[PDB]
C-alpha cells in the first residue's frame with residue numbers, strides 16, 4: 003500500500019487527529035466549519051490540519067510524493083454575495099497562523115509578496131475579489147493555485163452555487179509536476195477545472211502539514227466555509 | 239477495504255487479465271493500443287476489458303456501487319485531424335462487439351437509436367464529428383457521456399492536443415448519481431471537465447464489464463488510441 | 475496502490491466474478507460451499523476461483539509478487555469426525571480439475587507424485603489422515619503447505635473445532651520467500667500457525683488463478699467446507 | 711477506503727510523524743531502535759508513537775474499530791540471553807511514560823497492579839522472565855497480551871531466535887472481540903501464535919495513540935529492540 007491514507011466521512015466535535023487553529027471548529031451535526039458560524043455574524047479566520055506531518059519529498063533519495071485528496075464543501079451566503087473564501091493547503095509541518103494575517107489571505111499569508119520563505123502551496127476558492135481590499139484577484143469569483151503568494155499563478159472562473167455542495171478532487175502527479183483541481187456541483191451538473199505545473203521539492207520542505215483554511219473579513223457579507231468530508235492519500 | 243481495486247502502471251503483451259476484442263492489442267513497449275497501429279494504416283475497431291465482471295449494484299439490497307477510474311492516454315494523428323475516438327465504458331458482463339458496428343460507434347452500438355436494451359454507459363472522446371457520417375455529434379471534438387445511445391446526453395468541447403498525453407479521472411458518486419469526467423494535459427495545463435446525472439441501477443444489469451474501446455473509420459485520417467495506464471476501484 | 479485487491483464480505487448466488495468448478499456453489503444465505511451440502515449426503519469435489527488471472531511474477535523483470543489473503547471458513551461434521559478437507563490454492567491461469575482426481579487430492583492432483591508440471595502451490599486443511607487411503611498424511615488432522623504434490627512439504631497439527639468458524643490469514647513475503655498460515659478460532663482462542671520457504675518463480679507460471687477447493691470421499695463421514703468471506707491483495 | 715492506513719518501509723532519522731519518548735531513536739541505517747544502542751551498554755527505556763491519535767471507538771454510535779498491524783523486528787543479544795523485551799501498544803492519546811517506570815514494565819506501567827485507569831492494551835515480547843525482579847512472568851521467554859496490567863492475561867512460549875528477524879502480524883476483529891498475534895522467523899520457519907478476547911470499548915478511551923516500547927533493565931544482559939518496518943490500518 004501507499005505511505006499515507008485517511009478518510010473522514012464526517013467529523014466529530016473536538017476530533018483528536020485534527021489541529022484546530024483560529025475559529026475553526028466542528029459542529030454537533032458533524033461538519034467542519036473552518037469559519038465561525040454565529041449570530042450575530044463576526045469577523046473570522048480559521049485553519050484545520052491533520053495532526054501528523056507528511057513527508058512530501060525525500061532529501062536522501064530525491065523522490066517526490068504524488069498525492070490525491072477529495073473533499074466536499076458548502077459555502078452559504080445570507081445575501082447573494084459573500085466573503086472571503088476557502089483554501090486547501092500544504093504548509094511546513096505544524097505551521098502557525100502568520101502574524102497579522104487577514105481573511106483575504108486565508109490565514110496563510112502575512113503580506114501580498116511572493117516570498118519563497120512562506121513555503122506554502124494552496125488551492126484557493128476565493129469568493130471575494132473586490133479591488134479595494136484584494137487588488138491581486140481577477141474580476142470574478144475564482145479557483146486559484148497559490149504558490150508562496152496570495153497572487154495565484156493561475157486562476158479560472160468559479161461558477162459558485164450559493165448553498166450548494168461542491169465535490170472537489172485534487173490530484174498531484176509528481177512525475178509530471180502537475181496539479182489538477184476538479185470541482186463539480188452534483189445538484190446542477192455545474193463543474194470547473196484547473197491544472198498547473200508545480201515542483202513541490204522546489205517550494206515546500208520535506209515535512210509538511212495539510213489542511214484547510216478560510217476567512218470572513220466583513221460580517222456584513224457573511225458566508226459559511228463548511229467542509230463535509232475529506233479523503234487524503236499520499237505516496238513517495 | 240473496497241470491493242475491487244486494480245492498478246496497471248503499464249500493460250504487458252498478451253496480458254491474461256484483460257480480454258482483447260477486435261484489433262485491440264498491447265505493443266512490446268507496454269502500451270495498450272485499442273486501435274490497430276500499422277503501416278500502411280488500416281480501418282479498425284477494438285475493445286479491451288478487465289477479465290473479471292464487476293457487481294455494479296445489488297438487486298437483493300438496492301445498493302449502488304460508487305467507482306473511480308484513472309487513466310492516461312494519447313491520440314496521435316499523422317495529419318492535423320484524426321478519427322474516430324476513444325471510449326471508456328461499462329457494458330453487460332462479457333459483452334461482445336455488437337454485430338455490424340462501426341468506428342463512429344466505438345464498437346459499442348449496432349445503430350444510432352436510444353434502446354434501453356444496449357445497457358451501455360460510456361464516456362467518449364470523439365475526434366470525428368463530421369455530419370456526413372456522424373449526424374448526432376456537435377460541431378467540434380468533444381467529450382461525451384453516452385447512455386444507451388451514441389448520441390451523448392451531454393457533451394463539452396474537447397481541447398485535444400495532438401500527440402500529447404491526457405490524464406483522465408472519472409468518478410461516480412452513487413449517493414448523488416453524478417458522473418464526473420476530469421481531463422487534463424500536463425504538458426500545457428489545458429484541461430476540460432464534465433458532470434452528468436445517471437442512475438446505473440436504471441441502466442446496467444447487476445454484473446458489468448469495464449474497459450476501453452475505439453475505432454478508425456478511414457485509414458486516410460489515421461490517429462492512435464493508446465492508453466498508457468489504468469487505475470480502477472469500485473465499491474458497493 | 476497495489477496491483478490487485480478484492481474483498482468479499484459475503485458471496486451471492488451465481489456470482490459472476492467467480493468461476494465454479496465441480497460441486498462448488500453459493501447458498502442463498504450467502505456462503506460459498508466448495509463442497510456439496512445435500513440430503514442425503516453425496517460424494518463430492520469442488521473448486522471456486524476468482525475470474526481474473528493474477529500476474530504472480532514477471533519474466534521481463536524477475537520481480538516476484540507478495541500477496542496476502544484473509545478468509546473465514548467453517549467445517550461442520552454430523553459425526554465427531556469428517557472428510558476430507560479444504561484448500562486455498564494457486565494454480566496456472568484457468569486450471570481445470572485434473573482428470574481422475576479424488577477428495578483426498580482436493581481436486582488439485584491427478585496422483586500422489588511430486589511432478590513440477592502440476593505447477594500448484596496450496597495450503598491444505600486436511601480433516602482426513604487415514605493411511606488406508608491417504609498414506610502420505612501424518613497421524614492427525616493437519617494444516618499443510620503443498621508444493622507440486624499432495625504430500626505436504628511441512629505440516630502442523632490442526633486443532634479443528636467442529637462447526638466453529640476459523641479466521642485464516644495467509645501472507646507471502648516475496649523478498650524472504652516465506653509463506654505464513656495464521657489460523658485462529660475466535661470462539662475459544664484456539665490458534666495454529668505454520669511458515670515455510672517457497673519460491674513462486676520456481677514453481678508457478680507468470681499468470682496464475684487463485685481460489686479454494688475441497689472434497690468428501692465418503693458420504694458416511696460428511697462435513698461441510700464453507701468459506702464465509704474472502705480478502706485478497708497481491709502486488710509486484 | 712478505511713479510516714486510517716500508513717506504511718513505513720524504513721524509518722528516517724528524526725521522523726516528523728513519529729513521537730519519540732525516552733531513548734527511542736532512529737539510526738542512520740533507517741531502523742527504529744526503541745532501545746538505546748550504545749558502547750558501553752547503558753540501562754534504557756523508550757517508546758515511539760505515531761503522531762496522530764486514532765479514534766478506536768465511537769461513543770456516539772457504539773461502533774468499535776477493527777485494526778491490523780504488521781511489522782518486522784530484531785532482538786540481538788551479545789550474550790546468549792538478553793533483557794528486557796519489546797511491546798506494541800495502544801494507550802490514551804499522547805500518553806506519557808508513566809512516572810517511576812522500569813524496563814520490565816516496558817515504559818507502560820507505574821506498578822504491577824491491574825488498574826482500569828492505566829487504559830492500556832499491549833502485546834509484549836518479553837525476553838526476561840526471572841522471578842527475582844519479574845514475579846508475574848511465566849517460566850520462559852514469552853509473547854503476551856497485556857490488558858491494564860503487566861501481568862499478561864494470556865501468554866505463549868516465544869521461540870526467540872537471537873539476531874534473527876521476526877515478522878509479526880497482529881489483527882483485531884471488532885465483531886468477535888478477538889486479538890491475534892502472528893509471529894514468524896522467515897530464516898528457519900520458526901513461528902508462534904496467540905489469540906485472546908478483548909473489548910477495546912471497555913478498556914481504552916475513544917482516542918488512542920499506537921506505537922512501540924521496550925527496555926533494558928541491566929546493561930550486563932544487553933540486547934537490541936529494533937523495529938525495521940511498520941504497517942498500520944484501522945477502520946470504524
Ligand SMILES: CC(=O)N[C@@H]1[C@@H](O)[C@H](O[C@@H]2O[C@H](CO)[C@@H](O)[C@H](O)[C@H]2NC(C)=O)[C@@H](CO)O[C@H]1O
Pocket residue numbers: 321322340341342343366371372454455456458
Ligand atoms: C476518405 C473517406 O471518405 N472515407 C470514407 C469513410 O469516411 C466512411 O466511413 C465512416 O468513417 C467515419 C469517420 O471515420 C466514421 O465516423 C463512420 O463510422 C464510418 N462509417 C462506417 C459505415 O464505417 C466510409 C463509409 O461510408 O467510406 C469511406 O470511403
Ligand SMILES: CC(=O)N[C@@H]1[C@@H](O)[C@H](O[C@@H]2O[C@H](CO)[C@@H](O)[C@H](O)[C@H]2NC(C)=O)[C@@H](CO)O[C@H]1O
Pocket residue numbers: 793794812813814815838843844926927928930
Ligand atoms: C546485574 C544485575 O543484577 N543488575 C540488576 C538489575 O537486574 C535490577 O533491575 C531490573 O532488571 C530487570 C531485568 O532487566 C528488570 O526486569 C527490572 O525491571 C529491573 N528493575 C528495575 C527497578 O529497574 C536492578 C534493580 O534491582 O539492579 C541491578 O543491579
Ligand SMILES: CC(=O)N[C@@H]1[C@@H](O)[C@H](O[C@H]2O[C@H](CO)[C@@H](O)[C@H](O)[C@H]2NC(C)=O)[C@@H](CO)O[C@H]1O
Pocket residue numbers: 085086104105106107130135136218219220222
Ligand atoms: C463593510 C465594510 O466595508 N467592511 C470593511 C472590510 O471589508 C475591510 O477589509 C476586509 O474585508 C475584505 C473582504 O472581506 C477582505 O478581503 C480583507 O482581507 C479585509 N481586510 C482586512 C485588513 O481584514 C475592513 C478593513 O479595511 O474594514 C471594514 O470596515
Ligand SMILES: CC(=O)N[C@@H]1[C@@H](O)[C@H](O[C@H]2O[C@H](CO)[C@@H](O)[C@H](O)[C@H]2NC(C)=O)[C@@H](CO)O[C@H]1O
Pocket residue numbers: 557558576577578579602607608690691692694
Ligand atoms: C465408508 C468407506 O469406507 N468408504 C470408502 C471411501 O473411504 C473410499 O475412498 C475415498 O475416501 C477417502 C476419505 O474420504 C479419501 O481420502 C480418498 O481420496 C477416497 N478415495 C477415492 C478413490 O475417492 C472409497 C474408495 O476406495 O471407497 C469407499 O467405499
Ligand SMILES: *[C@@H]1O[C@H](CO)[C@@H](O)[C@H](O)[C@H]1NC(C)=O
Pocket residue numbers: 335336337338347348349
Ligand atoms: C445490433 O447488435 C445486436 C447484438 O449483436 C444484434 O442482435 C442486432 O441484430 C445488430 N443489428 C444488426 C443490423 O445486425
Ligand SMILES: *[C@@H]1O[C@H](CO)[C@@H](O)[C@H](O)[C@H]1NC(C)=O
Pocket residue numbers: 807808809810819820821
Ligand atoms: C504511576 O504513574 C502515574 C502516571 O504518571 C502517576 O500518577 C503515579 O503517581 C505513578 N506512581 C508513582 C509511584 O510515581
Ligand SMILES: [Ca+2]
Pocket residue numbers: 086087106128129130131136139
Ligand atoms: Ca479574495
Ligand SMILES: [Ca+2]
Pocket residue numbers: 322323342364365366367372375
Ligand atoms: Ca464521432
Ligand SMILES: [Ca+2]
Pocket residue numbers: 558559578600601602603608611
Ligand atoms: Ca487427507
Ligand SMILES: [Ca+2]
Pocket residue numbers: 794795814836837838839844847
Ligand atoms: Ca519481563
Ligand SMILES: [Mn+2]
Pocket residue numbers: 126128138139140144146152154
Ligand atoms: Mn485569489
Ligand SMILES: [Mn+2]
Pocket residue numbers: 362364374375376380382388390
Ligand atoms: Mn459523440
Ligand SMILES: [Mn+2]
Pocket residue numbers: 598600610611612616618624626
Ligand atoms: Mn495432508
Ligand SMILES: [Mn+2]
Pocket residue numbers: 834836846847848852854860862
Ligand atoms: Mn510478561
